Amino acid sequence: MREIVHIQAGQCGNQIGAKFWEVISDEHGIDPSGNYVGDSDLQLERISVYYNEASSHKYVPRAILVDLEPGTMDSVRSGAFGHLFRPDNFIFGQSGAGNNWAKGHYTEGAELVDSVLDVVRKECENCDCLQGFQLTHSLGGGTGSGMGTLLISKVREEYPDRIMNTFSVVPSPKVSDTVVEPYNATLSIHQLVENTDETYCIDNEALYDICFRTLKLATPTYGDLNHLVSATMSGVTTSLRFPGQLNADLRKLAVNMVPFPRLHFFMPGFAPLTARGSQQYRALTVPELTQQMFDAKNMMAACDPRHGRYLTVATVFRGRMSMKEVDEQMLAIQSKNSSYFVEWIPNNVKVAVCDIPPRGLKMSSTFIGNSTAIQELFKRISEQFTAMFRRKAFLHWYTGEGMDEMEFTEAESNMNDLVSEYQQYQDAT
Amino acid sequence: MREIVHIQAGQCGNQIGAKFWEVISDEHGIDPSGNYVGDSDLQLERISVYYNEASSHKYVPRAILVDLEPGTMDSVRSGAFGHLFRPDNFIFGQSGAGNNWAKGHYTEGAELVDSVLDVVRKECENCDCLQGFQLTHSLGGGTGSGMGTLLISKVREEYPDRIMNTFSVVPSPKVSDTVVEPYNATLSIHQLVENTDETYCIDNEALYDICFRTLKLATPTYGDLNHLVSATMSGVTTSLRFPGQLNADLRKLAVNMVPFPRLHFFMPGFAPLTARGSQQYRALTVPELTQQMFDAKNMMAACDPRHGRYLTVATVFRGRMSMKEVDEQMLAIQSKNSSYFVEWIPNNVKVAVCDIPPRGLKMSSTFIGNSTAIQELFKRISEQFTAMFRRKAFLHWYTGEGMDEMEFTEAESNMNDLVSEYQQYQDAT
Amino acid sequence: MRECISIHVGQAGVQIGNACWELYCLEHGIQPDGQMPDSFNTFFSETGAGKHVPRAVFVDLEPTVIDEVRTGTYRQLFHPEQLITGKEDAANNYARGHYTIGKEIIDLVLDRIRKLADQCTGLQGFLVFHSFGGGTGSGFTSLLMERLSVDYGKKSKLEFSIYPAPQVSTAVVEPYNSILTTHTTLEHSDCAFMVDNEAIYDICRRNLDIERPTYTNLNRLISQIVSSITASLRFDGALNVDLTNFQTNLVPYPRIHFPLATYAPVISAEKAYHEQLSVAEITNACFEPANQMVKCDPRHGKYMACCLLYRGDVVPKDVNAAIATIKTKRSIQFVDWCPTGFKVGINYQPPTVVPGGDLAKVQRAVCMLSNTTAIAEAWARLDHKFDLMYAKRAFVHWYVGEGMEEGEFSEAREDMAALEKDYEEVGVDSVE
Amino acid sequence: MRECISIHVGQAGVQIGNACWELYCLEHGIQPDGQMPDSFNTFFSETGAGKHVPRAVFVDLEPTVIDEVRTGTYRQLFHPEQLITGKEDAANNYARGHYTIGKEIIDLVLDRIRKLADQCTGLQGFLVFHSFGGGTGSGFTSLLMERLSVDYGKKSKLEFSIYPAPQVSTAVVEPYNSILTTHTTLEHSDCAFMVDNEAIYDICRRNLDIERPTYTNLNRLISQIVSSITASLRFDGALNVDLTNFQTNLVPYPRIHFPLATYAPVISAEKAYHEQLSVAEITNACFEPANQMVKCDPRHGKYMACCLLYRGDVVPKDVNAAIATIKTKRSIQFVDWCPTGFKVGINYQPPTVVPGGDLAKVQRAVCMLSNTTAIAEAWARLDHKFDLMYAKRAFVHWYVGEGMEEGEFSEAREDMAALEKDYEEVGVDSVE
Ligand SMILES: Nc1nc2c(ncn2[C@@H]2O[C@H](COP(=O)(O)OP(=O)(O)OP(=O)(O)O)[C@@H](O)[C@H]2O)c(=O)[nH]1
Ligand SMILES: Nc1nc2c(ncn2[C@@H]2O[C@H](COP(=O)(O)OP(=O)(O)OP(=O)(O)O)[C@@H](O)[C@H]2O)c(=O)[nH]1
Ligand SMILES: Nc1nc2c(ncn2[C@@H]2O[C@H](COP(=O)(O)OP(=O)(O)OP(=O)(O)O)[C@@H](O)[C@H]2O)c(=O)[nH]1
Ligand SMILES: Nc1nc2c(ncn2[C@@H]2O[C@H](COP(=O)(O)OP(=O)(O)OP(=O)(O)O)[C@@H](O)[C@H]2O)c(=O)[nH]1
Ligand SMILES: [Mg+2]
Ligand SMILES: [Mg+2]
Ligand SMILES: [Mg+2]
Ligand SMILES: [Mg+2]
CA distances from residue A24 to A29, A30, A47, A354 in whole angstroms, order as listed: 8, 8, 10, 16
Q: How far apart are CA C377 and CA D28, in angstroms?
A: 53
What are the residues facing B351 on neighbouring strands? Answer: B315
Q: Are residues D60 and D208 in the same domain?
A: yes
Q: Tell me, what amino acid is at C424?
A: E
Domains and CATH numbers, chain A: 3-257 (3.40.50.1440), 265-374 (3.30.1330.20), 375-427 (1.10.287.600)
Strands, E assignment, D296-355? 303-312, 342-347
Q: Are residues C276 and C134 in the same domain?
A: no
What are the residues facing D163 on neighbouring strands? Answer: D196
Q: How far apart are CA B300 and CA B291, in angstroms?
A: 16
Chain breaks in chain D (C to N over 2.5 A) after: 37
Is A181 in contact with A171 (CB distance < 8 Å)? yes
The size of the A-C interface in CB pairs under 8 A is 91
Q: Phi and psi at residue A217, in whole multiples of 5°?
A: -125, 125
Q: How far apart are CA A380 and CA D214, in angstroms?
A: 70
Q: How far apart are CA B164 and CA B254, in angstroms?
A: 10
What are the residues facing D311 on neighbouring strands? Answer: D347, D365
Q: What is the CATH number of the domain that holds D300?
A: 3.30.1330.20
Q: Is A145 on the interface with C (CB under 8 A)?
A: no
CB-based touch C/D (3+ pairs, under 8 A): yes
Q: Which ranges of A57-105 would DSSP assign to H, the alpha helix?
A: 70-78, 101-102
Q: How far apart are CA B58 and CA A277, in angstroms?
A: 14
Determine the distance in angstroms separating the CA of B75 from the nearest CA of chain A, rounded to an integer.
18
Query: DSSP letters of A119-148?
Result: HHHHHHHHSSSEEEEEEEEESSSHIIIIIH
Q: Are residues C76 and C212 in the same domain?
A: yes
Reply yes or no: is the peptide bond before residue D265 cis, omega within 30 of 0: yes
Number of H helices, E strands in chain A: 16, 12
Q: C392 lies in a domain?
A: no
Q: Are residues D313 and D244 in the same domain?
A: no
In the reported structure, the alpha carbon of residue D13 is separated from the centroid of ligand 4 by a whole-number distance in angstroms of: 8
Find, among B268, B267, B303, B312, the residue nearest to B376 by Cα: B303
Residue C15 beta carbon below 6 angstroms from any ligand 3 atom:
yes
**Which of C346, C376, C406 finishes a domain?**
C376
Q: D96 lies in a domain?
A: yes
Is A317 in contact with A272 (CB distance < 8 Å)? no
Phi and psi based region of residue C312 (left: phi greater than 0; alpha: psi -120 to 50; beta: remaining): left
Q: How far apart are CA C8 and CA C43, in angstroms?
A: 15
Q: Are residues D150 and D240 in the same domain?
A: yes
Is B146 in contact with B15 (CB distance < 8 Å)? no
- Other C-beta atoms within 10 Å of D103: how many? 11
The answer to whether D320 contacts B175, with C-beta atoms less than 8 Å apart, is yes
DSSP summary character for residue B180 = S
Chain breaks in chain B (C to N over 2.5 A) after: none
Instruction: Return the sign of the alpha-carbon dihedral for residues C180, C186, C191, C195.
Output: positive
Q: Are residues C236 and C320 in the same domain?
A: no
The answer to whether C316 contacts A99, with C-beta atoms less than 8 Å apart, is no
Instruction: Return the sign of the alpha-carbon dihedral for residues C296, C298, C301, C307.
Output: positive
Q: Are residues D294 and D220 in the same domain?
A: no
| CA atoms within a 13 Å half-sphere pointing along the CA-CB vector of B101 | 28
Q: Residues with Cβ < 8 Å from C143, sequence gap 6 or more?
A: C97, C98, C102, C103, C106
Find, among D15, D398, D16, D417, the residue nearest to D172 by Cα: D398
Q: Tell me, what amino acid is at B8?
A: Q
Query: DSSP letters of D3-61?
Result: EEEEEEEHHHHHHHHHHHHHHHHHHTT--TTS-----GGGTEEE-SSS-EEE-EEEEES
Q: D413 lies in a domain?
A: no
The size of the A-B interface in CB pairs under 8 A is 26
Q: How far apart are CA B164 and CA B151, in angstroms?
A: 11
Chain breaks in chain C (C to N over 2.5 A) after: 37
Q: What is the resolution of this structure in A?
A: 3.8
| CA atoms within a 13 Å half-sphere pointing along the CA-CB vector of C200 | 24
- Residue B222 assigned as binding residue: yes
Pocket of ligand 4, beta carbon within 6 A: D 10-12, 15, 60, 62, 89-92, 131, 133-137, 162, 170-171, 197, 215, 218-219
The approach used to solve this structure was: cryo-EM
Q: D365 lies in a domain?
A: yes
Q: How far apart are CA D294 and CA D377, in angstroms?
A: 11
Instruction: Return the sign of the alpha-carbon dihedral for residues A302, A308, A313, A319.
Output: positive
What are the residues facing D127 on neighbouring strands? Answer: D6, D158
Q: Are residues C97 and C121 in the same domain?
A: yes
Q: Which ranges of D165-278 would DSSP assign to H, the alpha helix?
A: 174-185, 197-207, 215-234, 243-250
Burial A153-162 (b: 16+ CB within 10 A, else e): ebbbeeeeeb
Q: How far apart are CA D173 and CA A58, in angstroms?
A: 95
Q: Is D75 on the interface with C (CB under 8 A)?
A: no
Is D3 in contact with D123 (CB distance < 8 Å)? yes
Q: How far apart are CA C230 and CA C234, in angstroms?
A: 6
Look at chain B and count its residues. Answer: 429
Q: Phi and psi at residue D342, in whole multiples of 5°?
A: -135, 130
State the Cα torsion D407-D409-D414-D419 to the nearest 10°: 140
What are the residues facing D365 on neighbouring strands? Answer: D311
Q: How far apart are CA B274 and CA D390, in angstroms?
A: 74
Helix (H) or strand (E) holding B199: strand B198-200
CB-based touch A/D (3+ pairs, under 8 A): no
Chain D adjacent subunits, 3+ CB pairs under 8 A: B, C
| CA atoms within a 13 Å half-sphere pointing along the CA-CB vector of A3 | 21
Q: Are residues D282 and D235 in the same domain?
A: no
Q: Is B393 exposed, middle or buried (0-12, 13-18, 19+ CB in 10 A)?
A: buried
Query: DSSP letters of D373-420?
Result: STHHHHHHHHHHHHHHHHHTTTTHHHHHHTT--HHHHHHHHHHHHHHH
Q: Are residues C180 and C51 in the same domain?
A: yes
CB-based touch D/B (3+ pairs, under 8 A): yes
| A286 interaction partners in chain B (CB closer than 8 Å) | none
**Atom 22 of ligand 2: nearest residue by CA position:** B98
Q: D281 lies in a domain?
A: yes
Q: Phi and psi at residue D222, in whole multiples of 5°?
A: -70, -35
Q: C401 lies in a domain?
A: no
Q: How far apart are CA B235 and CA D398, in angstroms?
A: 79
Helix (H) or strand (E) holding A79: none
Q: Are residues C180 and C270 in the same domain?
A: no
**Atom 20 of ligand 3: nearest residue by CA position:** C134
**Which of D212, D231, D250 finishes a domain?**
D250
Q: Is B418 on the interface with D (CB under 8 A)?
A: no
Find, among A152, A228, A226, the residue nearest to A189 by Cα: A152
Q: Residues with Cβ < 8 Å from C64, sequence gap 6 or more?
A: none
**Domain around D81:** 3-250
Q: Residues with Cβ < 8 Å from B103, sequence gap 6 or more?
A: B95, B97, B142, B146, B401
Phi and psi based region of residue D109 (left: phi greater than 0; alpha: psi -120 to 50; beta: remaining): alpha
Q: How far apart are CA A158 and CA A142, in angstroms?
A: 24
**Which of C200, C216, C250 finishes a domain?**
C250
Give chain C's domain count.
Answer: 2
Q: D409 lies in a domain?
A: no
Q: C426 lies in a domain?
A: no
Find, among B287, B328, B293, B288, the residue nearest to B310 by Cα: B293
Q: How far apart are CA B127 and CA C311, in angstroms?
A: 51
The answer to whether C339 contacts A384, with C-beta atoms less than 8 Å apart, is yes
Q: How far apart are CA C126 and CA D220, in angstroms?
A: 66
| CA atoms within a 13 Å half-sphere pointing along the CA-CB vector of B164 | 25
| C275 interaction partners in chain D (CB closer than 8 Å) | 47, 53, 79, 81
Q: How far apart are CA D134 and CA D9, in angstroms?
A: 9
Ligand nearest to the CA of A178: 1
Q: Are residues D176 and D317 in the same domain?
A: no
Find, among B183, B203, B86, the residue nearest to B141 by Cα: B183
| B94 interaction partners in chain D (CB closer than 8 Å) | 1-2, 122
Is C125 in contact with C4 (CB distance < 8 Å)? yes
Find, among D251, D162, D174, the residue nearest to D201 by Cα: D162
Q: Residues with Cβ < 8 Å from B413, sequence gap 6 or more?
A: none
In the reported structure, the alpha carbon of residue D133 is separated from the centroid of ligand 4 by a whole-number distance in angstroms of: 7
Q: Phi and psi at residue A108, in whole multiples of 5°?
A: -70, -45
In the reported structure, the alpha carbon of residue D65 is separated from the centroid of ligand 4 by a whole-number distance in angstroms of: 11
Burial C219-232 (b: 16+ CB within 10 A, else e): bbbbbbbbbbbbbb
Q: Phi and psi at residue C403, in whole multiples of 5°?
A: 95, 50
What are the residues facing C277 on neighbouring strands? Answer: none
What are the residues facing A265 on neighbouring strands? Answer: A199
Q: What is the CATH number of the domain that holds C215?
A: 3.40.50.1440
